[PDB]
Every structure is written in C-alpha cells, then in structure tokens.
Amino acid sequence: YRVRKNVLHLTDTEKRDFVRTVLILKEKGIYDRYIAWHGAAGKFHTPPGSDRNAAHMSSAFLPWHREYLLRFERDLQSINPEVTLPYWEWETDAQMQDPSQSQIWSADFMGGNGNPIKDFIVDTGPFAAGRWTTIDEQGNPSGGLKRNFGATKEAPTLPTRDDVLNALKITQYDTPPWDMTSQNSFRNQLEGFINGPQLHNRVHRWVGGQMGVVPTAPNDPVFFLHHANVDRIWAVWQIIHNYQPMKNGPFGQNFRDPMYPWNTTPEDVMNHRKLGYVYDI
Amino acid sequence: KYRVRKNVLHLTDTEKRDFVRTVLILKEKGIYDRYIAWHGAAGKFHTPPGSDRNAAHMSSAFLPWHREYLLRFERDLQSINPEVTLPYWEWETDAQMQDPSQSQIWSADFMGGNGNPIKDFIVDTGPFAAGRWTTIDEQGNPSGGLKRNFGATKEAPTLPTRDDVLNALKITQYDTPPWDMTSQNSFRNQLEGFINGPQLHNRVHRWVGGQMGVVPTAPNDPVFFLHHANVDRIWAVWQIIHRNQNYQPMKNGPFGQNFRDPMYPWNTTPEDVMNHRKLGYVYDI
Ligand SMILES: [Cl-]
Ligand SMILES: [Cl-]
Ligand SMILES: [Cl-]
Ligand SMILES: [Cl-]
C-alpha cells in the first residue's frame, strides 16, 4: 500500500520529487551509509575464503537487497511521505532501437551516458560531476559518477523481456551449493550467473562506470531503480510460489539467519506487503 | 546495572575458561566475524567523505561507537552462556610490571602469549594460536594465525601508565571542535591517544602489534575486546567525575558525530549509550 511505480508512469513532478529527495539524503549524509553497507556486505564472505558474500553469490542476494531498498525507501519517506521507490523495467527498454534514449536517462532524471572526452564522467542530469560526489572502494571521495552504456563485449545489450520470463519459469528458489554454480535456481538465474552475465549482473555491466562493479555500484542512483525491478521480478515469482536453504546452508544464508551487516533475516522480508509496499502491477 | 564487568585479574580460572570457550563458539557459528567486519567498515566510513574522521575513530563517536560494539558483543556472549560478561584488561597496572609480557592475561589458558619471532610472529600458544583460530585480512579473505609484536615499535615500546590515565580523567571537556585528531583539551582525543601519542588507546594497539596494530584487522585478536572494555571503563569513570559534563558535539558537527545521529553501521546513537547502566552493566570498580 506504498505503491512502487514503473519509471515510465511517473508524472514529471513525481520524478522531480524523487530526485529532490535523493539529493537531500545525499546532503544529509544518509546516502553514504547505503554505499558503505553494500560495499561491506560484498566483502563479507560466507563463510570466509568462500566466493559467497552476504549480499551476492549466495541465496541471500534477493532478501538482502529487498531489505536494502526497504530501508532506503523508508528514509526517502521520512523526507517526503509521498515518495516511493520506482522501478526501471529494463526488460522493456531493451526493445528500443537505442535504449540510451529511454526516458529514464532524461536530464531531469538520472541524466545520460558518460562523456567519452571526459573519460566517461556524466555531466547531464542531477548527478553529473560537480553536482554529486562519489566515493571509491576505499571510502575516499572519487571525483564523479561514470557510465558506460553497453561498452563491454560481454554485455552489449540489456536483458530482453524473454530472459525475464524464462527465469520466472524456474521452480526452485535456489539449489545447493547455494553459490554461482547453482543450477535450476531462480535466484542464481535472476542474479545473472547462468551463462553470465545475464539479467541482474547484465544490467550492472551494461551501465558501466561505478554500476559496473560491486564496491562502488550504489554511487549511481540507478542502482536503486535497477534493484527495484529485480525485487519486482522476485515478487512476481512469489505470487505463484518458499526459500532455500532453510538450515544447513552457510551462516548468513539460511532462512532464519541475520543478514549482514544487519540482524534482518530472509524470513523477515519474504512478503513485501508485510513490508508495507506493492508494485503497481 | 546487573551485569558485572570484572578485572581480568579478578577472574576465577573457570570464569576465564568459560569466557574463552564462548568466544570460540561465537567464532565457530560465524558470528565473531560479523564484528571484525563491522569495525573494518566503520573505519573506512569517513564523516564526512574525504575527511580524516571515520564512524568509529578519529572523532567524537569513538567512545559511544565502541561502547555499543562491546554491548552487542556481550549480548551475543550471554546468549551462549548467561554467566559470561566482558572482562577488562587494566593495562595501566600491567605497565608497572618489570616485564608486562608475563601478566596473567597472556597465559596459555587465556589470551595466549607473544608472537614467535622465529615464526614471523605468529602466536603459537593459547586458545587462539594459529591452527586453532581463523583470521581475516583487510579484504575479508582468510589469513595466517593471529600475530602479536609486544612493544616492538619505537613509537610504542611501553604500555600506558596510571599517570597517563589519571591526567586524562582530568580533562573537563568530552571533546572540542574540530572534533578530530587535532582536538585540544578533549577527553575523547586524549583517551583515544592522539595528543602527542601514540598514547593510551592508540598506544595499547601499537604495543600489542600484529592485527591489533592496525584498524582494518584489530578485532581479529580477542584482546581487542578486553582492551576496549578498559577504555570504556575509563570513560564510565570520567562520566562520573564530570557528572555535570555531557557529550559533544550536541549539534552542528559532522553527521554521524552528533549526540543524536545514527552510528555506522548501525542506527544507534551516542545518546542511546550515554549511561552504561541503562545498558544493563557496571564495572568491578
Ligand atoms: Cl502507475
Ligand atoms: Cl570479494
Ligand atoms: Cl501500472
Ligand atoms: Cl571481581
């Protein structure tokens, strides 16, 4: 009953207010806590020495990011009670002739692509360099947001709608060993590791810049619009369908286990409505 | 005000063997590691970005951050064994010893001893010797066994003294602007150890050496918690002395450093932990 809307459905004023609130969150110093939390989680392997981490490469990927967006949305709400987290339906923009033309990259929103002359720093939009500070891996100021639209040879295109529907056909949430090699797992599929980079991982690689990489991704506000759609994609599979592992998975990956760096568990966020929100569709 | 935190020198043999046993369980369950990660994350979180201050150190939130940290750690201990509380290492008395390396805190039945020069400095004695206790680097990856270099550095050859503690307790202000490493006449910056230091808190870290010597890995050594229990105790004492002296900055300080701001990576505030008793514990003395 907080309603999360397609970025395409967002009145010119709804978009202005969303952007407005993100800058305030940034100015207050709240935005940085989110970049830091995501960076910390990515370095927290479960268990140590493994490839899995608290926020990725593990069953926790989906509930971790759901909790993350919920907390982010609550902070937006405390600034402006009329603002909720919109979602970027990339599945849809992939059909465009040229996706970089999508209304999501308008100057009055998340601006555009990076400038090749400025080493791919983005100057168009509310988060252009000079208007929005970024930080690096190390937590030090980095000098500006960057974006490389489909510049990689492994990710030249956004995930096609189809890629979404096939994933939704998967019957298991996840499967052991609960890692990147999991087969027939909705979680690993949606995350993008099956014939990587696909879906989730694919959007990250397609955007480029800080979004391209784990330790700095959140620096780009589009991170939240991306994840909103991923969360929505997960909520859809759930209309039909339960989570795995329940016990016996690495600590931090189990159904009822604290999700770093919080005490939140996957169980705690299994139903989005219990969380106070619902996707328009 | 029920939970009693005791001098590591007042502990019975069993009490020590239960403390150690609970730490290993916390470790085995994977829970200990969430702590090391929290402290590492906080140290990298600058307030504000580009500054020298971070959420857990080099600023006013140094004391309440670590108090919250120990409280959470103590609660996990107790969920494992309700009779175990966090003891404190009174380093200022150990400094008196001819050879502090001999303090009972370093027994093979407690913290274990110094590192072995013959082995780079890996600690090979005690419950946390290499082979018995897993360690993590500044990247979150596994690393060789705990390491300790007792007073090996030229800057910190000795543990802080009672005189050093007393003098600090003498400061009238909790902190002063700019609320960082250069703060003068501030209890916080002096207890932390930056005034002419390395001194006090920073000095113990430097004296121990090994992972305890650097911010990103320091919690890998269980002694980190015994150290910070004494630092917390010293703060609790100061609070009593200057009853009519609250926390600072109350406001208009960097976000994350003010009296009512959330402390990374938690939502908890300095106000939330100003009175230790409200937190359910007290110190031996
Ligand atoms: Cl709508
Ligand atoms: Cl990693
Ligand atoms: Cl709709
Ligand atoms: Cl006692």
Ligand SMILES: [Cl-]
């Ligand atoms: Cl790694």
Ligand SMILES: [Cl-]
């Ligand atoms: Cl006593």
Ligand SMILES: [Cu+2]
């Ligand atoms: Cu991520």
Ligand SMILES: [Cu+2]
């Ligand atoms: Cu992601």
Ligand SMILES: [Cu+2]
């Ligand atoms: Cu520290």
Ligand SMILES: [Cu+2]
């Ligand atoms: Cu310390």
Ligand SMILES: [Zn+2]
């Ligand atoms: Zn709609």
Ligand SMILES: [Zn+2]
């Ligand atoms: Zn790592």
Ligand SMILES: [Zn+2]
């Ligand atoms: Zn779709």
Ligand SMILES: [Zn+2]
């Ligand atoms: Zn098709």
Ligand SMILES: [Zn+2]
């Ligand atoms: Zn739903």
Ligand SMILES: [Zn+2]
């Ligand atoms: Zn830094």
Ligand SMILES: [Zn+2]
């Ligand atoms: Zn007291």
Ligand SMILES: [Zn+2]
């Ligand atoms: Zn006692």
